[PDB]
């Protein structure tokens, strides 16, 4: 068939989830239908698929691939985890939906890394990302190898920095910098908006996270007081890709379509439309 199950995850501006208009029960404008499984209560696992609408940069990518590669789709939001983590040797999140064949492809702010590429096939990257470091203007740090991060108890008071756990950023820090990682779990942040609030009010000195999201947040920080270090510098450069099952037949035609959007200027215009900010 060419009707595909596709999974995504909310993360502005890549994927933004909205309520459907109640009278019409239709998604209009630049949005597309998506469903999210929502539990009735905490005692059992009975639940309802709620009809929502989805928009954003990755959704515009999905709409373009659907026309060019010639498929239709049932988009749903992942509810078992987030982007993807191997937990007790079992992948959850969007990666897990693809590994375990509930989804033919995962679309969103999904970072390409080595361990995920052993269990899924990724498209070419369609947006550059990596790891950036956000601080309040004036906070001085050189990069991920700053001694303040690498050996934090060499300093008094110790530098306060954290990430949002369970994604590719935390996985990367765990693999390369064991002391830094175990130190920073004290400052784990539930999500990006918690972390920005913690920075602006001096409860946190630095927030380490996906470069594409941080550079977007910096570009519309109110007051332009939050900045990424090194003028938007990206460590461990990679990209977001579409995840497909190993050996998927869609991979070649998705890759070529994404590269065609690059060569026709369409990727440039989508970045300008969704990822521009006022601050600089």
């Amino acid at each position: 068939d060419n009707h595909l199950s596709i999974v995504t995850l909310e993360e502005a501006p890549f994927v933004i989830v909205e309520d459907i208009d109640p009278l019409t029960e239709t998604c209009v404008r630049n949005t597309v239908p998506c469903r999210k499984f929502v539990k009735i209560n905490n005692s059992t696992n009975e639940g309802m698929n709620v009809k929502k609408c989805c928009k954003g940069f990755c959704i515009d990518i999905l709409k373009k691939l659907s026309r060019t590669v010639k498929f239709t789709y049932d988009l749903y939001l992942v509810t078992n985890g987030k982007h993807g983590k191997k937990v007790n040797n079992v992948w959850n999140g969007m990666i897990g939906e693809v590994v375990y064949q509930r989804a033919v492809m995962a679309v969103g702010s999904l970072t390409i890394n080595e361990e995920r590429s052993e269990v899924v096939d990724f498209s070419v990257p369609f947006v550059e990302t990596g790891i950036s470091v956000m601080v309040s203007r004036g906070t001085q740090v050189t990069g991920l190898s700053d001694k303040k991060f690498q050996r934090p108890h060499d300093y008094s008071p110790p530098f306060r920095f954290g990430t949002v756990p369970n994604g590719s950023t935390e996985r990367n820090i765990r693999n390369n910098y064991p002391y830094m990682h175990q130190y920073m779990t004290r400052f784990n942040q539930r999500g990006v908006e918690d972390a920005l609030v913690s920075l602006k009010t001096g409860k946190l000195d630095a927030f380490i996270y996906d470069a594409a999201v941080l550079n977007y947040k910096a570009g519309r920080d109110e007051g332009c007081k939050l900045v990424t270090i090194g003028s938007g510098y990206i460590f461990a450069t990679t990209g977001y890709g579409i995840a497909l099952q190993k050996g998927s037949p869609w991979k070649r035609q998705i890759d070529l379509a994404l590269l065609q959007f690059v060569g026709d200027g369409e990727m440039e215009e989508l970045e300008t439309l969704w990822l521009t900010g006022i601050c600089h």
Partner: protein
């Protein structure tokens, strides 16, 4: 069994210098103090193309040495005989199209791998396999220190006049890219009045206030701003893409080359090459 690697002279990714009078490579050192790793690469210097052994080094050579040790293969390097990256050109009589340059050598089996700053794009990916990018790049603008250009959407570029002259290299990949985009027609028309024959000449004209802005590869331009401190890059990158290693379809090395590149991004090896060869 020895992989035939083809590459091209393109600083700072691949430098090409003569051998010493005994036929060895001269001992040299990087800023960081480490010895520069050099490999012998044969190739030329309507003329006859006498192939003679030369020295090759830089970002791409460092990468090759790492991939070879990592994936356990031996290699011999030569310079592309016609000196081109690779475009499709019509054979005489309008029979078919044939790839020239590194692309033609890879497809005809004169090489097994392209290790070069080879832009990933749709036309090439139809015919060869690219790794995941080993370097994410795009276009930026080189200007005299002091000059304020926000990027490709700056009014002095969108609304051109003789008061602010900008240009690229004639018949380069950039020139071709601009010519194909209808939304850039106004910009192409101004550039074709002023395009230069080589990057070196355009960079010199920026120095001598005959060109106000040079549109080119960001990696090259950041390398240039590192050296000559009267020039800077300015504005957000645009028309982003990446360089990939090129292999033939269903080559047995494709997946492991890509995983090794992802690994080297994630463990800081690639950022270390960026520091050694691209920025200062």
């Amino acid at each position: 069994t020895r992989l035939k690697i083809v590459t091209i002279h393109q600083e700072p990714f691949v430098y090409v210098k003569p051998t010493m009078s005994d036929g060895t490579c001269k001992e040299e050192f990087t800023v960081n103090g480490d010895p520069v790793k050099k490999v012998i690469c044969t190739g030329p210097n309507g003329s006859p193309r006498h192939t003679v052994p030369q020295c090759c080094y830089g970002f791409c050579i460092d990468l090759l040495i790492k991939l070879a040790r990592t994936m356990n293969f031996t290699y011999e390097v030569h310079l592309v005989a016609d000196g081109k990256f690779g475009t499709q050109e019509r054979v005489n009589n309008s029979n078919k199209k044939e790839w020239n340059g590194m692309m033609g050598e890879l497809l005809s089996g004169q090489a097994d791998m392209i290790v070069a700053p080879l832009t990933i794009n749709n036309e090439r990916a139809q015919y060869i396999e690219f790794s995941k990018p080993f370097k994410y790049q795009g276009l930026t603008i080189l200007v005299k220190k002091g000059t304020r250009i926000t990027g490709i959407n700056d009014p002095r570029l969108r609304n051109p006049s003789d008061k602010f002259i900008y240009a690229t290299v004639k018949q380069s990949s950039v020139d071709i890219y601009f010519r194909r985009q209808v939304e850039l027609s106004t910009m192409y028309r101004h550039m074709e009045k002023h395009n230069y024959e080589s990057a070196a000449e355009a960079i010199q004209a920026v120095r001598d206030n005959k060109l106000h802005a040079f549109i080119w590869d960001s990696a090259v331009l950041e390398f240039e701003a590192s050296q000559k401190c009267d020039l800077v890059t300015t504005g957000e990158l645009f028309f982003r893409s990446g360089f990939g290693i090129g292999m033939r379809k269903d080559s047995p090395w494709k997946q492991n080359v890509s995983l090794s590149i992802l690994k080297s991004h994630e463990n800081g090896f690639m950022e270390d090459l960026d520091k050694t060869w691209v920025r200062y």
